[PDB]
Ligand binder design. Structure first.
Ligand SMILES: *[C@@H](C)[C@H]1/C(=C/c2[nH]c(/C=C3N=C(/C=C4\NC(=O)C(CC)=C4C)C(C)=C\3CCC(=O)O)c(CCC(=O)O)c2C)NC(=O)[C@@H]1C
Ligand code: NA
Lengths: 162, 172, 162, 172, 162, 172, 162, 172, 172, 162, 172, 162
């Protein structure tokens, strides 16, 4: 898995060399940012259920046809509502993984790789998840660099969907 | 590979679970003790040449059959390859030390090494003897109280020793 | 030239992507370490001439034949002593470049690349320069992380000579 | 490539001189302002998709012959290439912003771009118009006082605007 | 551009050989199929405006929100309905190009290459164009092998959107 | 690979014999039924996306452990690989249908697939269940009497089903 | 084995794609041509022994020294005459294979690959076999497109020998 | 490359227009004359070896400086390359004949050939003479009424002669 | 690979010893007899085509099943591969003859050949019979007293025959 | 042009190194053999016309059909006899080049490269030239190593034709 | 590349002529004088390191701007490239000396070297000065009468000097 | 192992050829030189211990610090003196191997490969071994081409250390 530490190791290993002072400074950079990252991860985790429910309702509010139209890809029944809240929880959970890992590794590996193909295949609109992520950004209640960290990874997810 | 943070995250994703508050506390502690970890990596790295050279010199002193003609480390090409192996193992031990996890050392260095040495005829038991000499030298350098903030690096030193012992066991 | 910033940019450029939060954390790691690096570079620069003169005398004392034997590679005459002091100043100056740059880029590009060929071709013993570098380490008068930064790059040069 | 630190180091090595106290002071000030620079890069990176999309939409609104059949941006393949070019230029502008130096933008992006566009038939003047639209949006995002510690970013913003202007001028 | 003829020559040219009876049979197979292809092309061309306007209207009833929601990607104003009708006309026109050419060359080069990126970037839903293509399939009025030729290329475009 | 004609030719060459009247008759019958064969390939190809997607959706509905966290098809990368395998098997089945011979399916797709799945941990029995779902959908599409000249496609349908069964048997 | 059908499959497989309408048209082109191809294959097979003996006699007339000169490569004895009639039967048999397959695959793989090396090694003159093939072209008794098919593959064999 | 169908479609896409009824009529006429075209390609291909060899023999008979020691076609390696060039040009002429368009011959064969010959010292004027001899032999083979349904191939023959003439002019 | 000199050197190095006077005498004898060795290599090389062709012709006359339809040497591609194998073995035998040591023939030709033939279905017993035929013909060519200074090459011929027997035994 | 010297230089250059004692010994080997090669080249040159006329006659006596059959590839007329004596002269002349250069470089570059294609294209039999070469070998009148040198290169050309 | 023998042969083949008796006599003389040529090559090769190092040391003595900071030969990477260039030219001069022909020097070393130096900013006049210093040292080593059979190598020394002068002229 | 013979075989094997006359002349060149090579190898072998002791002493007297300074790389004790004499014996022994084999193969493979790394790692000065080699050159007492052969391989080792 890609993290600031394993990326530094992979770079040194590619060049067949010991870790450089540049890479040790890079890892301390992660160490220095970790306080803000962990604050964001704790808060997103503690309010995960309320954040997931609110994000799902925000999507339905913005795109009411998703609770209207018949179809396997929509949330007009109990099955589709469970699928949607499950998906949004996946986004939130993996964002906290990225905050804790110190990089987008978990997002890239667990969610973004193949994301385009999955949404195309199952007729899932990227705009739905963008709206859900925008809601999480607006309601995580963080400030300072904790909010910066949270918003950086949320924006990364939104970019992956745009 | 995995570091200490990726290990927890990967296991949690397998169960589909958010990290608990206790897991978050534990990774915050890893960050808190990270400065000591960086010193250990920097001290081993900064002394890599002497750690390798002294351990190899002592090895050949104790095992002269390695360097006599017909020995495995005889000729300068085989000597250079032997010294290289010493350095490779030390390098992957410093990788595992930075990561706080042995996976990079097992995956990219130790796995298949006994079978590689068996095919070549490299005496794996003597490699293990050289690895143990590097361990003792590296640990003494890491634990050296001169020119560093006094503190407790016992858990770190125990970790680093386990990486060296892992490498020695993989070829002994 | 390799610096923590250009290494981050080069990594993103090889992958054809925008800079990652991992790489921004890496650059802040350099920014946080810079105060120690700059303190080391200041003290080494301010005492450069004394450090060069003392290091040269330390080499001449450890290896007395270098001041007596005839040959272009030794410092038995005024020409050779000038070459030696020049060389040692090169080492100190480029070490301060590395401290300022935040990595071994200057050392690697200006001095270490081709070092082994030059020492072999001109019959210069690496042990001479190791002794000079050991002198600088013991006489830079630095403490704390400023000493760590200076000794990291001095040890890096010593490893390149070993 | 060069950043602000490498540029001073390289100039000093050419003269064979140590860095002066004023040069070290200037570089410490670069470090002091580094947090603001990191925000500028993060904010531009975090909004890259909308910066590119909105600039391109406005460009086609103002220059409809680009997207008419037979136009340079007609067909989805050429539209995708046009959008990619916008994103590429924005990408290297954020590189130069991190480095505090235009070298990476000049060397790896703008050098030879006019000749490439001229050989392809790409209207470089229209690319310049889209780049400037990207500048105004990116600067607005960087200057946003919401959710950031209030301070003076005017020197940073003038620098970033200069990289965009450099890009537009290299193809206009 | 790819046609059955240019594809046959390309295969022979890659092998550095003269055209074989395999490629001549391939080209004659195109010749035999052309009557059905030409008949479909004519009927889609002569009925284009009504097919285009019917397909756009088909999307609007299936997805009513496309004529109600605010946003550049929707058709709630004359600008967006001109965009949509233009898009559907692009699909129809290039389908007739492919029918005439004997393969998907025109569809592949003019429309499908970069299609996923354009729909993601401009937030256009593929299901919109699928529904439009389904209407064209159900309303071109063709029969026999002319309907086969038309439906094959319509289904090819629907596959590229799925 | 072989088609129906190359198979008989290669068999005759091994015996150094001209083709018999019976073999020429059989091969002429392949030609006479060729238009039906092209409809079958065209119909499966034209519906490939829905055949794969509907079979995958039903598979996951019946086997939820595949898409639970930690399941073999969990994460989008693994889901994409699983959908890709479904499409790959469908693709090579349509190749074999055009050729009138399973060699291309066996040699370029099924040979080694079981061992690949075993090393990866892919549940081949679940792939076989997905293949069977693709079979039934494809057969129903081929045998649809709307929009086609009515006639007997029973032998072709049996042949196509046999190719699907070969794929299932290679991994079950 | 290369045939029009396997070549279409190989082309689609190379691009990792489903078969295209261009390839289905190419295969139907092969199907349409098979009637002429198979009529030629049947006529060549039904008269094989007469064509083989007549061709061998045509070679012996054109090159009388082949029945007079001594050596393993000539047909001055029963062993050499048997080798010659064998080879000519090989050519005829594999031409009917190519007709049945709808392409030169059988000729390419069973006979032409290595042909130059064999004729050089065993001191066999290509002109002998050209004459045998010319006799076959003149006496197969076909007309129309069946004669066209037969002559195309006979000419291909002559080209391989020239 | 382009064929008669691709030519029309590409120009219509540039104008953003459907094909007109008259353009569709002309393309249907291209198909109707398709059997004649296949015969011309088949007949030139089937006689390629004699077309090349007889033209080359006549060229060297008329221009003996080519084959005398020091001549450009002297030594077997240069003679082989010369024969190969003749076969190459004939090959691309048959390509253009099948396509009904000279683009493949212009783009893949003739473009830059004069420059190449100039740099090597190949006498392009002598190549053009060989091409014209190949043209006369190929036209006579194509236009031979023995063994073919009688009809008018004069337009196709003029087209084929133009491709040969185009090749000769590019190196003359 | 080794020659006669490298063999003695490599064994001496393994023991860390200078060559003895007896070993130097023996190597001086190799040099003294070198002209005869060069003759053997030149004669075998100069007659390679007929050695291979005659041995192959005799093999197929003795084993007609090899060249019947379906036989391993049937078709011209397999016949050429068979002739190539005959030539490769002869080639490596001449290599060993020049070297005075079988190592090049064992390492680069014979090692793994039996398993290669096993996987392909090449009948190695027939290859060994072909090799023996090449041996007899090559020996008679080397032994031919016409056009060469009369002398004793019995040791050389026995060495050469040993390389042929080695090749045959590796595949028999 | 490959010679023993240029091949030695090419091996050193390929390895980016100065010439080794192995290469110097290789060149002296050429120098030691040169006396035999020049004796052979002198004798073949001095009797060139007689050797060429006798070799051509040897081919006509072995293959008398070459003086009777009609066709551009035979020698039934003055043109054909001129061609054939020219060809045999080329073989003899380039064999002397090879003797002088010390290797088959001249034969390889001037004659053998492309030989197989030329003899196939113009329907010339390799057996004709093998017979001519066998005549030269039996009639050059050389002894000792001079005969060895000439025969070695004649056999090399015969092998290239076999 | 050519040597003395290939140059005459190539000229003869262009004329289609057998070598004359005077041409064979001259090449025989080249062979007779070949031992001296081998001595010259061996002597230059055996002293290559001191020839290069002494010439470079003298060059930097006389042109100190080359090794000042900012000079072309400053930093160890550029110094090593400079020493490498010296060795390369010496290497190719020894090549030309063995071949008795300058073609290998012109074709593989000197052709395009001036343009390369111009693009890089390498002072070609200083390279020529270094080459001249190598010439004098090499010529004196070749002409050393100690430890070699006394004779006349003046023509060979003039030839070697011309190769050095050729190299210097190509960059000066 | 690289020798003039194995090099010739390797060249022919790379191009899939039989050995050429160039290669056979190369090998005879080695045979002709072998008399000088073996005479040099015998003399060096017979006086090996005297040359080794005299070479060691020559180094000790040119670099007196090597017998006085403390350190594992120096010969100030019996361990270091034994290491040095052992090394010099290795040089002389492998030089005789090269003479016997007719090329630098034994020196390249047994000694030079990895030499720079070993001397750097163990802090051994190449100048020490150059001096020992210069003593051997000055005291082997050979004359004629035997001396030329010995000096060639001694100079080869000296260049490898320079
Ligand atoms: C056990 C290994 C020894 C030891 C370690 C130790 N260090 C600290 C404090 C610090 N170490 C660093 C080092 C770095 N920070 C970076 O970013 C980098 C990469 C460029 C490095 C190499 C720093 C900055 C500190 C903090 C400042 C300081 O000097 O104190 C401690 C105390 C902190 C803690 O307990 O975690 C310790 C214990 N101390 C010993 O006694 C062992 C010999
Ligand atoms: Na994008």
């Amino acid at each position: 898995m890609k993290t600031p530490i394993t990326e530094a190791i992979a770079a040194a290993d590619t060049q067949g060399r010991f870790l450089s002072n540049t890479e040790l400074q890079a890892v301390n950079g992660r160490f220095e940012r970790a306080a803000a990252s962990m604050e964001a991860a704790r808060a997103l985790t503690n309010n995960a259920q309320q954040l997931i429910d609110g994000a799902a309702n925000a999507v339905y509010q913005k795109f009411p046809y998703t609770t209207q139209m018949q179809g396997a890809n929509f949330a007009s029944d109990s099955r589709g509502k469970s699928k949607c809240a499950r998906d949004i929880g996946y986004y939130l959970r993996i964002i906290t993984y990225s905050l804790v890992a110190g990089g987008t590794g978990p997002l890239d590996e667990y969610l973004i790789a193949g994301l385009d193909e999955i949404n195309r295949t199952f007729d899932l609109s990227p705009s739905w998840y963008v709206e859900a992520l925008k809601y999480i950004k607006a309601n995580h209640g963080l400030s300072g660099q904790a909010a910066n960290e949270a918003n950086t990874y949320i924006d990364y997810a939104i970019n992956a969907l745009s | 590979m995995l570091d200490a943070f990726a290990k927890v995250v990967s296991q949690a994703d397998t169960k589909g679970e958010f990290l608990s508050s206790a897991q978050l506390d534990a990774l915050s502690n890893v960050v808190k003790d990270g400065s000591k970890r960086l010193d250990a990596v920097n001290r081993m790295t900064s002394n890599a040449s002497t750690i390798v050279a002294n351990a190899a010199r002592s090895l050949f002193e104790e095992q002269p059959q390695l360097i006599q003609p017909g020995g495995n480390a005889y000729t300068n090409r085989r000597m250079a390859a032997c010294l290289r192996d010493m350095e490779i193992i030390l390098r992957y031990v410093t990788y595992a030390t930075l990561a706080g996890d042995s996976s990079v050392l097992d995956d990219r260095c130790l796995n298949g090494l006994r079978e590689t040495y068996q095919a070549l005829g490299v005496p794996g038991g003597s490699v293990a003897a050289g690895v143990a000499k590097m361990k003792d030298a590296a640990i003494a350098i890491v634990n050296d109280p001169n020119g560093i903030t006094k503190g407790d690096c016992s858990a770190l030193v125990s970790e680093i020793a386990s990486y060296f012992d892992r490498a020695a066991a993989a070829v002994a």
